[PDB]
Amino acid sequence: QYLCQPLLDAVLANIRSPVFNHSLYRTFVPAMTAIHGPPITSIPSVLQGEVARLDPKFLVNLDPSHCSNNGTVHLICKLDDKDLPSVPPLELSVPADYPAQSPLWIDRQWQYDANPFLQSVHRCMTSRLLQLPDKHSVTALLNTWAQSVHQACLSAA
Amino acid sequence: NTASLCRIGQETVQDIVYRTMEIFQLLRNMQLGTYQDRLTKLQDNLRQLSVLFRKLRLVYDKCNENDPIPVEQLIPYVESEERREIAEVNKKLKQKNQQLKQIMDQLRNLIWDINAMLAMRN
Amino acid sequence: DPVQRYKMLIPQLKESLQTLMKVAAQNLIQNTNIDNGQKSSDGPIQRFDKCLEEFYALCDQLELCLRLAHECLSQSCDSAKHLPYPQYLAVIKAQISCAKDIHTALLDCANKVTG
Amino acid sequence: MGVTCVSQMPVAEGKSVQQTVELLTRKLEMLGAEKQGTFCVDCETYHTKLMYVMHNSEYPLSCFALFENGPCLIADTNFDVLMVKLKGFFQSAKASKIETRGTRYQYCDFLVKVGTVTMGPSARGISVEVEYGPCVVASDCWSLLLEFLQSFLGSHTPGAPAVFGNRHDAVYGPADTMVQYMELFNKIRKQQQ
Amino acid sequence: VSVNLEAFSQAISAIQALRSSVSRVFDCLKDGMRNKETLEGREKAFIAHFQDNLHSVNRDLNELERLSNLVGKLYSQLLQAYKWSNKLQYHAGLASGLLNQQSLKRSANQMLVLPPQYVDDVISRIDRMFPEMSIHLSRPNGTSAMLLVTLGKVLKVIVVMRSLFIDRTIVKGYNENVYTEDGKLDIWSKSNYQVFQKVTDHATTALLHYQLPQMPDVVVRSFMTWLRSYIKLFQAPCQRCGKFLQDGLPPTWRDFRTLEAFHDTCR
Ligand SMILES: [Zn+2]
């Protein structure tokens, strides 16, 4: 701005000439080189990060079935915990570009029938799924699953 | 023996750091007879520190002379006349501690009575 | 004097900056008018390089004056930190000897630890 | 001798003085103040220059004699008897007895006394007095009093009585409260309507 | 004075910055426009760098001018010893601070008796500094010294020592009678107000907090340093909520090691 303007006017006047840097060189390099001397002397890794940090309750493994080494990935988890009862395995479909979007829980209504207890597990799980914020992780789904199993143990007894 | 040599070796490293801190405080306070006194204190501290280093190398060599069990095999996860000597001295200072508690209680009560009686005289 | 030399050197510094920027713009415009196809008067073009070294000479004078004044004032501060002239020389040799004693005590015992 | 501040709460432009007093004491009962008794302040003027004789409830054994710009006397209650013993040199100057009556609320070392200024039968204004116990130096805890008055007065918040305006480290005294009360009473007598 | 030292070192760095920024302007102009994929992007980059360099030169010149507005005005063996003394003093200060922050001492064990004259000398030494605090020692009950520390027109603190180590403190207000009927110190009382009972509690945490094991002079000096900060009661606002009053209390908490005001509810 002040005390520097005519340089700025000269250089902004003379941009887009192909001989521009020639002009700068010819007008500036002999002074500088006299004073200053001569010049100088398969699976996306976000999911591996999630699975590597899970609690040893969960036992997440890939589905033998379904497409592999391609966009989306598919998981069959498990649940081991003395406090919690054995439950249906749970099926997850993680999209490619996994963060910035929410994974999907593959619903299997037919195995969550044939007991009152698994029905309570399923109702409570769909409730906490509706309660979830958007763009949640895989671990949010797995933890809502474990909390759903715990509530269905407590509500029953 | 050697399992007290380890304790002495820990105490030497704990003393060396504290002694260097005291040396740096002496060098902080020294303002260009007390000149000579601070000189003597500095030289004596440095002498004692060199003694501590020699003692530390001695204790290191003694404990490093006298391992078949690696560590992390030593932690319990979930899933004979010297014992009688210990029990003897334990019973002895049990009785000594109870007698010391009686002496301490009587001193406390005498102090409290003196302060109460002298507080009320005014 | 160093404050007043500093007040002397400031407007000269602004003048050298003004001349340096304007002369840089003049030389660049002349070289672009030769490099692109343009007529331009030769004239009193007033070389750039002299202005650049003149600015550097003024900055050397400024940093020289300020380093001198800062050394002088730090000097006076530690001198006040520490009336017959032989009494002055006695306490001065006392101070020099005492600092020598601290230094040799530290060196001899830091060598007495190892080697 | 804690720092106090005395002010006039205005009429409110509507309703009775009693209803505005109900509003202020209601706000005080919101904030957590507790009633701890009642208070009365009496002022009379005596003339041959004017002298004032004042009584607080808070200092029940004391009577204050205020000479409007001159010095204040504090004395025991027998001073009143001396005025009855004077009786010819200093006439009583009746129809200028003035009182404030009200309840005193305490809210954590703040004493708030809200009274109704009653010249004879008719009540003609609201006096509000806030005393801050701990502070003993005027103009230092003034901002505390300002925040408390901004908390419950809101608008009509007074500012800096001139007894504070003597700007030193002067220790506040009990005479300054009666000075402020005398200034308030003179303003209400001149307000009249 | 030290402000001239700091202003001169400041303006030294200002000249070095001005010179280097001018040379940086001309060096970046020497190289010329770079390539930068997009043509629009390369024009933008060159213009931005040139403008930033020019602005930095202007800022450095302005700072030099501002310092100009604010500026004010065998023998080598002695100066060498002076420089080496200041160097050793600063070096020892830093190393002592770093080492006593992290001590490895775990226990005093390996493998109180004082003349009252010494206590009076120590406490008079503390009373000589802090000109707004007056400390008046007395010994009504034996060797245990009792101190009245008045503080401005604000506080009266009754400190009850035991062998040159603070034991109990009671903070009362200025007007409050700290004397009994017989004119002795009222060692056992409270202060009729909420504020000063809170400050007694904070003073008891202060004497529980400033505990060196051996040397007691730093303890009493640091306790009086902390106590001196209470002179801005009724004037300092809380550094968390901004206001003066929480539940009708001023900020009674002067925090240790950084004497800042807080309401104790605001921790
Ligand atoms: Zn607060």
DSSP result, chain E: -HHHHHHHHHHHHHHHHHHHHHHHHHHHHHH-----SSHHHHHHHHHHHHHHHHHHHHHHHHHHHHHHHH----HHHHHHHHHHHHHHHHHHHHHHHHHHHS-----S-------HHHHHHHHHHHHHS-TTEEEEEE-SSTT--EEEEEETTTEEEEEEESSSSEEEEEEEESSS--B-TTSSB--S---SSHHHHHHHHHHHHHHHHS--SS--HHHHHHHHHHHHGGGGTTTPPPTTT--S-SSS----EE-TTS--EE-GGG-
Torsion-angle region of A78 (φ positive above 0: left; ψ -120 to 50: alpha; else: beta): left
DSSP β-bridge partners for residue E170 = E158
**Chain C nearest C-alpha distance from E73 (Å):** 6
Chain B touched by C83 (CB under 8 Å): no
Best E2, E9, E12, E15 member to test C by mutation, with max C CBs in 10 Å, is: E15
Distance CA D54, CA D44 (A): 7
Dihedral sign computed on CA atoms, order B87, B91, B96, B102: positive
CB E141 within 8 A of CB B119: no
Query: Which residues, including other chains, have CB under 8 Å from residue E21's CB and lie 6 or more apart?
Result: E53, E56, E57, E60
B8, B14, B27 ranked by CB distance to E106: nearest: B14
* Element spanning B96, H or E: helix B81-119
Q: Do B11 and E88 touch (CB under 8 A)?
A: no
DSSP codes, A85-109: PP----EEEEPSS-TTS--EEE--T
Best C54, C62, C101 residue to mutate vs chain E (most E CBs within 10 Å): C62
How far does CA A121 lie from the centroid of its chain?
28
DSSP SS3 for D59: coil
Contact D144 E243 (CB under 8 A): no
- Looking at the partner chain, which of C55, C74, C82 has a beta carbon nearest the beta carbon of E5? C74
Alpha-carbon span E41 to E90, nearest angstrom? 51
Q: Given in angstroms, what resolution was this structure solved at?
A: 3.5
Report yes or no: D66 and D83 within 8 Å, Cβ to Cβ: no
Q: How many CB pairs under 8 A join C and E?
A: 64
Alpha-carbon dihedral angle through residues E179, E181, E184, E188, given to the nearest 10 degrees: -60
Experimental technique used? cryo-EM
Of A3, A20, A29, the CB nearest to E58: A3
Residue type at E8? F
* Burial annotation C3-22 (CB, 10 A radius, 16+ → b, else e): bebbeebbeebeebbebbbb
Question: What is the CA(E243)–ligand 1 centre distance, in A?
Answer: 7
| Cβ–Cβ gap A6/C21 under 8 Å | yes
| Helix or strand (DSSP H, E) at D72 | strand D72-76
Distance, CA of B78 to chain centre: 34
Q: Which tokens belong to E222?
A: 């640091």
CA distance A26 to C29: 12
CB-based contact A87:A149 (threshold 8 Å): yes
Contacts of B20 in chain C (CB under 8 A): none
Q: DSSP secondary structure string, D87-132?
A: -SSSB---S--EEEEEEEEESSSEEEEEEEEEETTEEEEEEEEEEE
Distance to chain E for C93, nearest Cα, Å = 8
Chain A neighbors of E29, CB-CB under 8 A: 11, 24, 28
Give the Cα separation of A146 and C76 in Å (integer).
Answer: 75
Query: Which of C22, C53, C73 to mutate against chain E (most E CBs within 10 Å)?
Result: C73
SS in 3 state form for chain C? CHHHHHHHHHHHHHHHHHHHHHHHHHHHHHHHHHHCCCCCCCCCCCCHHHHHHHHHHHHHHHHHHHHHHHHHHHHHHHHHHCCCHHHHHHHHHHHHHHHHHHHHHHHHHHHHHCC
From C99, C112, C113, residue closest to B32, measured CB to CB: C99
Interface with A, mutate which of C13, C29, C55, C58 (most A CBs under 10 A): C29
Chain E residue nearest residue A17, CA to CA: E33
Strand, coil or helix: what is D179? helix
Give the whole-angstrom CA distance, residue D125 versus residue D188. 7
The Cα–Cα gap between D48 and D67 comes to 13
Q: Do chains A and D touch (3 or more CB pairs under 8 A)?
A: no
Question: Rounded to whole angstroms, what are the CA distances from B4 to B49, B55, B61, D154, E110?
Answer: 21, 14, 14, 74, 11
Alpha-carbon span E53 to E139, nearest angstrom: 72
Kindly state the helix (H) or strand (E) to which residue B83 belongs, with its residue range. Answer: helix B81-119
Angle at E32 between CA E29 and CA E34, to 5 degrees: 130
Closest CA to E14 of E22, C22, E231, D81: E22
Check: CB of residue D119 under 8 Å from CB of residue D97: yes
C4: left (phi over 0), alpha (psi -120 to 50) or beta: alpha
Coil, strand or helix at A19? coil
Joined tokens for residue D188? 């209400």
Closest partner residue to C99 (CB to CB) among E16, E68, E81 is E81
Asked if E55 and A15 come within 8 Å (Cβ–Cβ), the reply is no
Q: Which helix (H) or strand (E) segment is B99 a member of?
A: helix B81-119
Q: Is residue A103 a contact partner of residue A95, using CB atoms and an 8 Å limit?
A: yes
Nearest in space to D175 (alpha carbons), one of D67, D80, D51, D103: D67
Distance (Å, rounded) from C-alpha E121 to C-alpha E117? 6
| Distance to chain B for C108, nearest Cα, Å | 10
Which residue of chain E is at minimal alpha-carbon distance from A2?
E58
Q: Note whether D120 and D48 are within 8 A (CB).
A: no
> Are E83 and E30 within 8 A, CB to CB?
no
Strand order in the sheet with D110-119: D3-9, D122-132, D110-119, D98-106, D34-47, D50-55, D62-67, D72-76
Cβ partners under 8 Å of residue E133, min gap 6: E127, E149, E150, E151, E224, E227, E228
Answer yes or no: are the C-beta atoms of E216 and D131 closer than 8 Å: no
Q: Is A65 helix (H, G, I), strand (E, B) or coil?
A: coil
User: Taking an 8 Å Cβ-Cβ cutoff, which residues of chain E contact chain A?
Assistant: 23, 26-27, 29-33, 43, 46-47, 50-51, 54-55, 57-58, 61
Q: Is A31 touching E (CB cutoff 8 A)?
A: yes
Instruction: Tokens for C67, please give them.
Output: 């380093």
CA distance D130 to E221: 38
Q: What is the DSSP letter of D171?
A: B
Q: In what order do the strands lie in the sheet with E146-151?
A: E133-138, E146-151, E155-161, E166-173
